[PDB]
Amino acid sequence: SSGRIIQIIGAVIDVEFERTSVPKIYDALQVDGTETTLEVQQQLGDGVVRTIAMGSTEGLKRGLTVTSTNAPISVPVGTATLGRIMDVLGRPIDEAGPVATEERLPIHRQAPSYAEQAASTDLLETGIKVIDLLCPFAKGGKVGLFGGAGVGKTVNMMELINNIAKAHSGLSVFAGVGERTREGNDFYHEMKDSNVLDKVAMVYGQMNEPPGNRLRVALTGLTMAEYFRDEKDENGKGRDVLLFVDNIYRYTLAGTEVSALLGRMPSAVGYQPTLAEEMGVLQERITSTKSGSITSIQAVYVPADDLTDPSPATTFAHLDATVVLSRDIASSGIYPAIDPLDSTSRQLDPLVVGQEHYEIARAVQNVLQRYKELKDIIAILGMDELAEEDKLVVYRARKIQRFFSQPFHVAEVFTGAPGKLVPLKETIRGFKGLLAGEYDHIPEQAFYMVGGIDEVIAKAEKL
Amino acid sequence: SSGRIIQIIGAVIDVEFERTSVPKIYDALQVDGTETTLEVQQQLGDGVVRTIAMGSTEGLKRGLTVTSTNAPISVPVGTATLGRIMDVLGRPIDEAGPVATEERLPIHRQAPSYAEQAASTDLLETGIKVIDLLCPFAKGGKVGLFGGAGVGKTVNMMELINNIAKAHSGLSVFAGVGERTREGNDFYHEMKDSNVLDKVAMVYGQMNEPPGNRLRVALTGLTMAEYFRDEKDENGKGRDVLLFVDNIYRYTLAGTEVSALLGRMPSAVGYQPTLAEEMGVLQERITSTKSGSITSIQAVYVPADDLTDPSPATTFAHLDATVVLSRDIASSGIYPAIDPLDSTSRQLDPLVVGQEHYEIARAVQNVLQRYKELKDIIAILGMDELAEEDKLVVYRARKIQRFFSQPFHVAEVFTGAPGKLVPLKETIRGFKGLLAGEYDHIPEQAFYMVGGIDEVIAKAEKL
Amino acid sequence: QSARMVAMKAATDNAGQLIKDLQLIYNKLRQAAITQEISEIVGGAAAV
Amino acid sequence: AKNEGTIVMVSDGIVRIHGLADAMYGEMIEFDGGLFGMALNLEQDSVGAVVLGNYLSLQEGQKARCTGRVLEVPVGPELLGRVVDALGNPIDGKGPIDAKLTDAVEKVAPGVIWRQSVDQPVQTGYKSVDTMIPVGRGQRELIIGDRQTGKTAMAIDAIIAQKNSGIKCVYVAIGQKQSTIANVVRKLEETGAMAYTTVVAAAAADPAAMQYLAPYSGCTMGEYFRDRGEDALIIYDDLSKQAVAYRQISLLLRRPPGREAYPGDVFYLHSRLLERASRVSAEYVEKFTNGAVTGKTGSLTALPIIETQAGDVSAFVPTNVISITDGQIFLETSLFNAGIRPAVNAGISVSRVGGSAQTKIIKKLSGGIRTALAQYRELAAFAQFASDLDEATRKQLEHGQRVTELMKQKQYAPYSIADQAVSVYASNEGYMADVEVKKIVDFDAALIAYFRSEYAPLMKQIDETGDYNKDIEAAIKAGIESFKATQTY
Amino acid sequence: LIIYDDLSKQAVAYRQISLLLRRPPGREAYPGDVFYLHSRLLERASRVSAEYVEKFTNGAVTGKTGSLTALPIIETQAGDVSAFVPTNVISITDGQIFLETSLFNAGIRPAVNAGISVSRVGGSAQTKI
Amino acid sequence: LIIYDDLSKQAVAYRQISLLLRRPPGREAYPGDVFYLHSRLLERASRVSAEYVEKFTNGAVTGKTGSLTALPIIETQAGDVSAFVPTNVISITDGQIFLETSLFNAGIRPAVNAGISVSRVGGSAQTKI
Ligand SMILES: Nc1ncnc2c1ncn2[C@@H]1O[C@H](COP(=O)(O)OP(=O)(O)OP(=O)(O)O)[C@@H](O)[C@H]1O
Ligand SMILES: Nc1ncnc2c1ncn2[C@@H]1O[C@H](COP(=O)(O)OP(=O)(O)O)[C@@H](O)[C@H]1O
Ligand SMILES: [Mg+2]
Ligand SMILES: [Mg+2]
C-alpha cells in the first residue's frame, strides 16, 4: 500500500500506513516526486512509524505519498569502488559516471560472534617518537585519538596515513562523518596526484548536511571495509584492509540531536538514554575476525576540553591504544601535543615489547609524574627552596618534554622545515642515555624538533 | 465585553473573555468594586488571558467582573508632577492631594528608529571637576554607580539634580526599584530640607510589593522623562533630562521572579530565558534625539562578587562609564569620594574630546598610578633614600588629590560655604598648569575644597 | 636580611596571582553546579 | 480554506496557527498588517510559527495566509551603499531599492568536487595578521576575544583596506545599540568605503527572531558575487548574540537543555552558516551561469566575531566554533591594558591554510615566527626563578621582547606588503639586536620612511609583484645597511 | 520587640507546602515567590509617627509614637552565605550580626565577628554617653 | 567465589531500561530502586551453618558448612566517590580496596591506598601464622 505523511518536525517524519502493510524497522522508504528517502526507527501502533529523512525537508508538506521498498539501505560493494567518492546512499559524487557493480550488501548487520575472534600480532612501526615508546601499535588493533578543538587530531591522522600506509600492500577505506568539506577536497587531489588513488575508497558526509546524513555515513564505510576483509581470492589470498574513520563524536551528536524529537526522556547532561548501546553497536563491527584483519585509526572529539563527559568516557573501553592530546601542551609550541601521562596502550607488556623497553618507559613516566607534583612549591616559593634531587628531576623532565617533539612531513606548509623519521632503536638509545646521567650539560633549547639524538648533539653547538 | 476570574494562584490570575474582544498583551484591566487592577502577560486558547495582579489577592473569590481599558497602563505626565511621590500606577502617596495634570501617556512604547539618532556625540557638563575630567559623561549615555552606604550616594544624586537644573535648565526623574521604606522616607525628608524636591518627580517601588509592581516601576519614570524631553518651547530645542534607577539588579531579579511565577524553563544559573531582550527593552529608550536627550544614572550590585554572572554581564554591555565610590577617600576627608583610578569612561579618547584633554587626563592618571606604586615603598622603608623626581611626583599627586575635592550647593544649609559650578575650561587650565610645574610653590592646604584656580591663588595669598 | 625582604615580597605577589586564578575556577564550577541541579529538578518535576 | 488559518495562541513572540492544511516547512506566512512569519513545525492538528516583526499587534482569532514561497531576500548590485534590516527593507530613508532577483535564505553548500584550494591572499593592513595568520580568498578566520578589546576595529580596517582590490563587502550587526550602528555607518561613509558595502542591522531592541535570521540573509546577499566569478567579504559582528537568541527561542519552545542550558543543533546552527563561505572552481561557475562567464573562479571570505568571559576559550560556544573555522585570532585583555593595542596572542591563535595564501616574499620571510613567540611566552613566564643562565636564555628572551615590541600598530594605519617585508627581514637578520627595547617602533617607522622617500622603484616593484630573488634581497640588505649609519630614528 | 527563632525552617515548610501544591519549582526547588514571603513579613517592623497613632486611636492617645523591633535568626551551612535564602534575607534587613564557629572554640564566648557586621542606623540609636 | 567485573555498566543498563519504560528519574537521571537493585544482589553472599546444609541435603552430607564470597568492581570518574552509585554501593559492602591513579603512575604497581582501605572481618579471616 501507499503511505501518507501526517507530521513533519525537524528532521523526524512519521508516516501512517495501512493496517496489514506496516514496514519493518530500518526499512527504506521513498517519497514520490522528490529526491528524499526515509528509514524506519520506531513503531507506535495504528500503522504509524516514526522515520528519519535521509535528505532535507524543503517543500515538504503534510499529505504527500510514500512507497515502501521493503528492504534496508543497500550500497554497492566490490573492487569497482576503488578510486571513487560516494555519499551516504552509495551514489557517486565525483562526476565520473556510475559504479558498474551489481553486488550490494545491507547496511545493517550483526556483530561477529565470540568464536570467530582472533588474537593480536606483530608490532606496527610508525616513526613517531612518542607513539613508538609509550603507546605501541599492533596489527589488527584499534587506535583512538583524543583531543580538544584545534589541538592537532587531523594533522596526526594525516601523518599516520603518510607514514604507515605507503609501506603497505592492500586496500584502504576513508570515511568522513561530519568534518570540514575543505579538508575533503585536499585528500582527494593529494591521493590523485600521488598515484595512490587506484586502491582507496571514500565516503563523505560533512557538517553542512542535515542530521539524517551524518547519522548513517559510518555504516557505509564499515560495510565496504567488512566486504574487503571477508573476500578471498582464488588459492585463498588475504587483503589486510585499513580503515580511517574521522570524528565518531558527530555520530553520537546527531543521535543526541534527534533523540528528543524521537520521543525519549533525557538523561544526564542532556544525552540520550541509549548512548552506550549505540556506541557498542557501531564499535563492535570494527574488528579482525579469523578470516581477515582490520587496522583502524579513529579521532574522538572531547567537548569543552573535559574527559569526564559521558560521550568520551564511554569510548575509552572500546580501544586498545588511546592517545590523549592536551591544549596546555599545544599552547606551548610543542608538537605533537600528546600527553605522556594519561596515554596508555595494551601492548606495553614485558613479554610483548621486551625487558628494556618496558623499563625505559616506566622510568620516563615515573620521572614525569614526580616532576608534576612539584608545581605548587615552585609556584608559591622560589626554585631555590628545593633539594638538589628535585632540581635534577625538574631539569630532566623539561628536557624530556622538549625531546618528545619532532617535525612532520605533512606540517611542512605551516612552518617550512623538512620532515623527519626516527627508528625505534634510536628513540630507545636516546632515552636510555638521557635517563642514565649524560646530557646534563646540553641546554634544553637543543631538544626542540630535532628528530634523532645525534641531531641534538649537532644542534647543541648552534643554539 | 466583560470577563470573570477563573483561577487564583498567588499573584497569577486567569480571566476568560468573549470570543472576539480578548485584550492584547500588556492591556491593563480593572476589577469592578475592588481596587485591584490586572495586566495581561500571555494569551491561551478558548479566550483565556493569563494576568498578574498589581495589588494583593487576599479577599478575591472566583466569578467577579473585570472591565478592560483596552490600553496599557497610563500615567499622568506634565509639570504638575514635580515634587510629588507616586507609585507604579501614578497615584499620590504623600497625602498632598490629587495631581492637577489631566493628560496621560502609555508606559509601553517602541524605541526611536535608526533615523532619529543624533548625528554627533556631545559631552554633558556637570560642574564637578573629577567627573568632568576623568569620567566625562555623554548626552544619551548610561553611567553605572558602584558604591555602598555611608559614602555620599544621595548627596551626589541631589548635587547632580541641582547642577543640571541650574546650568542646562533641565529636570530629573527618580525611580526606586525595590527600595526600603525607611530609606525612602529619609530621602524625601532630606531633599525637602535641601530645597531640591521642587525640581524632581519620583516613583517608588516598595520592597514588600508583588514582583509585578517592582518590575514595571522603571517604565513610569522612563515615560515621565520622555515627556519632559519632548516638551518644546519656542524654536523647539527640547530639554536635557536625567533619570535615576536605585538598583538595576532588582529589576532583573523581579523579571526572574515573574518569569518563574508564570512558568517557563529556567536558563543558565536559574535566570529567565528572556533576559537580554528584557534589559535591552529598557536600555534602548535612553538615547539622544534631534530634539532633546536623556541621561541615566544607575546603581549596580554585583552578586557574589562574580563579574561573569549573567546579570552584570548583561548590564555591562550597555554602560558607557563607571563611577566608583571608595571608603578610603571618604575616611581621608575628601568629598565627593570618587576613586580617580578605578573610574572608567568610554568617551576618554582623543577623537571625541580632542587631543589636549586626553593628554592631560592620561598624564594625571599616570602620576596618580606612580604615587600609588610608591606609597608602599615609602611606608616600608621611609621617605628618604629616594631621588628628586619621585618626591616631585609625590607632592604633585598630593596637590591633585586635594584639588579633586570641592564644595556643593546642597551643603550650604549645613556649613555655610557657597557651592561651586566650575566649568571644564578652568579645570583643564588648572590641571595643565599644575602638571607643567607652575604651581610648585603654593602650599598644599590652599588646594583643599576651594573650587576653581584663581580661588586657589587667592586662598594661597591669604595664607 | 635584604634578600629575605625580596623573597617574601615575591612570595606575596605569587600567592595573590594564584588566589585570583583559583577564584575564577571556583566561580565557573559553582555556576555549572547550579545549572546542573536546576536541570535535574526540572526534569524530575516534568516526569510526574 | 486550505490556505487560510486562524491564530489560537500568542505568547513571547511565538504563534500557534490552526488550519493551514497546505504549507511547507520554512514558508513565509502573511498576517494582517504587513507582518510576516515562518513555519517551524507541522504537528498533526496545528502549525507553529515565529513572527518577524512586532507581535504586540496580533490577537487570537485573526487571519493568516500562505504565500507559497520560502524565505527570500533581494540580491544584486543595487544594494551597495545602502542600509537595510534583516528582511532587506531599507531603514536609512534614502528611498526604495530597485531589485531584480531574489534568493533563498537557507540552502546547502556546494559539494566536495566543486571546490578549489585557496591561493589568493587578502590584505588587511596589520603586520601581526598578514605575517603570522594569513588570510586568503575563500578561507574563514575567527576573531575571538574579550569585551572592550578592539574586535570591531579590525573588521572595519579590513573592510577599508579593500579600496583598490575590487571585492565587495557585507557587514552584519546583531544585538547592538543603534548609536553604535549609526557611528559605524558614519565612519564608513567618511572614508568612502560605503561605495562598495552593504549593511544589515538588527538592534538590541529587535525581536530574537530577527537577530537569529540576519546572518543567513547576509550570507545569501554575499553569495551573489561568489556564484558569478567575483570575490566578497562578510563580517558577523557577534555570533554570540545569535546563539543567545536561538537559545531563547528554543527554551520558549520547551526543548530539553544541555551544557550551559544550550540545546542540540547549536553546532549545526553555527556550522551550516560558515560552511557556505568557500571558493568554487571554474566549472561550477560555467554551469551556474550557463556559459555566460568562463575561466573565472568565485570566492567568499568570512570573519565572524565571538566574545568570551574572563578570557576563557575552553567554554562551550567559544570551542564549538573554533572546531569549524580555519583558524582564529585571539585578543587578550591583559595585553590590551598593558599598551600593546593590536593585542594578538601567539600560540593560541593559528591559521589552518598556512603559507599557501601569501606572496612569495612574505611566505619565505615569515617562516616560523609564531612558534618562537609561543615558546618565548612560556620561557618568560617560567624563567623568573633562576640566577645564572647561559647566553641562550638571554638571547631568546631579548629576541622575544624585540619581536613582541615590533608588532604594534595604530588604528587606521594600513601597511603595504613592502613595509612588512622590510621590517620582517630587518627583524630576522638580527640588525635590531643592538637597538634598545624602547624606540623599536620609532626605529622601524623611520626605516620605512627612509625606504619610501628613497628606493621608490624597488618598493613599488615589490608592491606590485610579491617575488624576490638574490638581486632584491641584496638591494634590501644594501639599503638597510646604508640606513643603519648616517641616519637618526 | 519580636524574635523569630529560625526563618530557615519556615522557608523549608513553605517549600514543602508549595511543592505538594504543584507550584513550579526553581533554584533549590524553591517556588517563585520566596523573596516576597520574607519581604512582606519583615517590612511590618517599623516606627510610626504621632499622626498615625492619633488617627488610629481617634484622639484617645496624643503625642506618642509607636515602634516594633525585629531580630530574625538564620542558620548557614558551612558558612555559605551565598545560598538562596541567606542572600534573600540579608538584602532586606538593616544590618547583620555574624557569629563564627572558630571564634566560639577560640574562647570568645559571645563570638561576634566585628569587621563584617554592620548597622545601617548607626550612632543615631544611642544615648549621649 | 564470584566476581562482577563492573557494576557501573549494570547500573547504566538498568537506568536505560527504566527510563525507556517512562519511570520518574532522580539524581543524575537515575530512577528509584537502585539501592534495592545493588543491595538485593550482594546480600546473597554469606556463610551457612552445618544445620542449614544438613536440612538442604536431607542428611546427605553432615558436619559441613558452605560459603560464597563476592568481589564486585566499580569505576569512578576522576576519583569522585561522592557520586550516586559509588555512595550507594560503599555503604552496603563489608570493606573497600582503593586504587589510586597517582600511585600507579608513580611506580606502585599494586596501587593499593592504605589507611583509606579497611576490612571489617579483620584478623578472624587469617591463618594462625
Ligand atoms: N590598535 C589600536 N590602537 C589604538 N586604539 C585602539 C586600537 N584598537 C582599538 N582601539 C580603541 O580601543 C577601543 C576598543 O573599542 P572597539 O569598538 O574596537 O572594541 P570591541 O571589541 O568592538 O568592543 P565592544 O563590542 O564590546 O563595545 C576603542 O576606543 C578603539 O578606538
Ligand atoms: N603536528 C602539528 N604540527 C604543527 N602544527 C600543527 C600540528 N597539528 C596541528 N597544528 C596546527 O593547528 C591547527 C589545526 O590543525 P588540526 O590538525 O586541524 O587540529 P585539530 O584537528 O585538532 O583541530 C593548524 O592550523 C596547525 O597550524
Ligand atoms: Mg579534525
Ligand atoms: Mg564591538
Compose a concise summary of this entry.
Chain C is 96% helix and 0% strand. Chain C has one helix spanning 2-47. Chains in contact: A-C, A-D, A-F, B-C, B-D, B-E, C-D, C-E, C-F.
What does this structure look like?
Chain D: Belongs to the ATPase alpha/beta chains family. Chain D: It catalyses: ATP + H2O + 4 H(+)(in) = ADP + phosphate + 5 H(+)(out). The structure is cut from a larger assembly and holds two copies of chain A (463 residues), one copy of chain C (48 residues) and three copies of chain D. Chain A has helices at 131-134, 153-164, 181-193, 211-230, 249-262, 275-283, 310-315, 327-330, 355-372, 377-380, 388-403, 412-415, 424-436, 454-460, and strands at 4-9, 12-16, 28-31, 37-43, 48-53, 66-68, 74-76, 85-86, 104-106, 142-147, 172-177, 201-205, 241-245, 294-301, 321-324, 344-345. Chain A is α/β, with parallel strands linked by helices and 463 residues long. Chain C is an all-alpha fold. Chain C is 96% helix and 0% strand. Chain C contains one helix and no strands. Chain C is rod-shaped. The termini of chain C are far apart. By secondary structure, chain D is of the alpha/beta class. Chain D has three domains: 1-72, Elongation Factor Tu (Ef-tu), domain 3 (Beta Barrel); 73-365, P-loop containing nucleotide triphosphate hydrolases (Rossmann fold, 3-Layer(aba) Sandwich), CATH 3.40.50; 369-485, Lysin. Chain D is 36% helix and 18% strand. In chain D, α4 crosses α5 (239-252) and α11 (369-382) crosses α12. Chains A and D meet through β1, α3, α5 and α12 of A and α6, α8, α11 and α12 of D. β1 (4-9) of chain A pairs antiparallel with β4 (36-42) of chain D. Bound molecules: adenosine-5'-triphosphate, adenosine-5'-diphosphate and magnesium ion (MG) (2 copies). The site of one magnesium ion (MG) has 3 residues of chain A, from α2.
